[PDB]
């Protein structure tokens, strides 16, 4: 999971 | 006959003001994944605002998996804002  | 400048819109946001929206590098974004899951299953019998509540429920329960990074066990909360003035049903596949 990573940030937009 | 007169209208306000803006009405009859519903806008779904992946996250809240100030916060990050989360995306899995393999499965795509949490919000779009939830949105497609809910709309595909429930557009037949649920209006759009109510489906976005189901999306919210899925998002609230999700948790980040990214050990060793800033995002491990992180959370997200989606929201929607609405100027709709009645139920929005998509009536998929009707009339046959």
């Amino acid at each position: 999971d990573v940030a937009d | 006959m007169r209208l306000p400048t803006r009405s009859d819109m519903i806008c779904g946001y992946a996250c809240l003001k100030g916060t990050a929206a989360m995306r899995n590098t393999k499965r795509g974004s949490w919000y779009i994944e939830a949105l497609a899951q809910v709309f595909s299953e429930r557009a037949c019998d649920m209006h759009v605002a109510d489906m976005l509540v189901k999306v919210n429920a899925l998002i609230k329960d999700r948790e980040g998996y990214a050990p060793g990074t800033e995002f491990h066990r992180c959370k997200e909360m989606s929201e929607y804002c609405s100027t709709l003035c009645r139920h929005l049903y998509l009536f998929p596949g009707h009339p046959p």
């Binding site: 937009d4 | 209208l3 049903y89 009707h94």
Partner: protein
């Protein structure tokens, strides 16, 4: 994927309290995804954006929309091409509209591939009762997959 169909009984018991939504196509839909960014501001390649894009294109087609697509657009291109989309005469004979925007963003704005920002208030305005008469009183859906800041939510334990 599969979109389960509405029953005729369901339509009969709900059409009177809902927006009119029976046109073919149901509406035009626009899916705009930015994944690869090349401005002075470094923005990370959006791995998995490809999956989001194809999922929505499929979903909106299966829901009976005529799906228009845009990929990897600058801020200026996004405003111009959204305005062009809002202005299409085809909206006059449809019952609804869908716009999905997928990109990096900040509170109230989304990035183009050039690292410049388009304000979301300007986007909604293109489809409003003043600027888009063809969609007056018709339901307009927007889905915005973008960050609204860089605070990560560490969450809280249930009390």
């Amino acid at each position: 994927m599969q979109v389960k169909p509405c029953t005729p009984e369901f339509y009969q018991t709900h059409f009177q309290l809902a927006y009119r939504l029976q046109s073919r196509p149901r509406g035009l839909a626009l899916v705009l995804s930015n994944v690869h960014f090349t401005g002075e501001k470094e923005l990370e390649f959006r791995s998995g954006g490809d999956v989001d894009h194809s999922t929505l294109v499929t979903l909106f087609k299966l829901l009976g929309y005529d799906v228009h697509v845009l990929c990897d657009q600058t801020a200026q291109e996004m405003q111009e091409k959204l305005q062009n989309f809002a202005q299409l005469p085809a909206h006059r004979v449809t019952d609804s509209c869908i716009v999905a925007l997928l990109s990096h963003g900040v509170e109230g704005a989304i990035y183009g591939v050039d690292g410049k920002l388009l304000q979301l208030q300007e986007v909604f305005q293109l489809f409003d009762n003043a600027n888009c008469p063809s969609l007056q009183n018709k339901p307009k859906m927007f889905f915005i997959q973008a960050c609204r800041g860089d605070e990560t939510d560490r969450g809280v334990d249930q009390q």
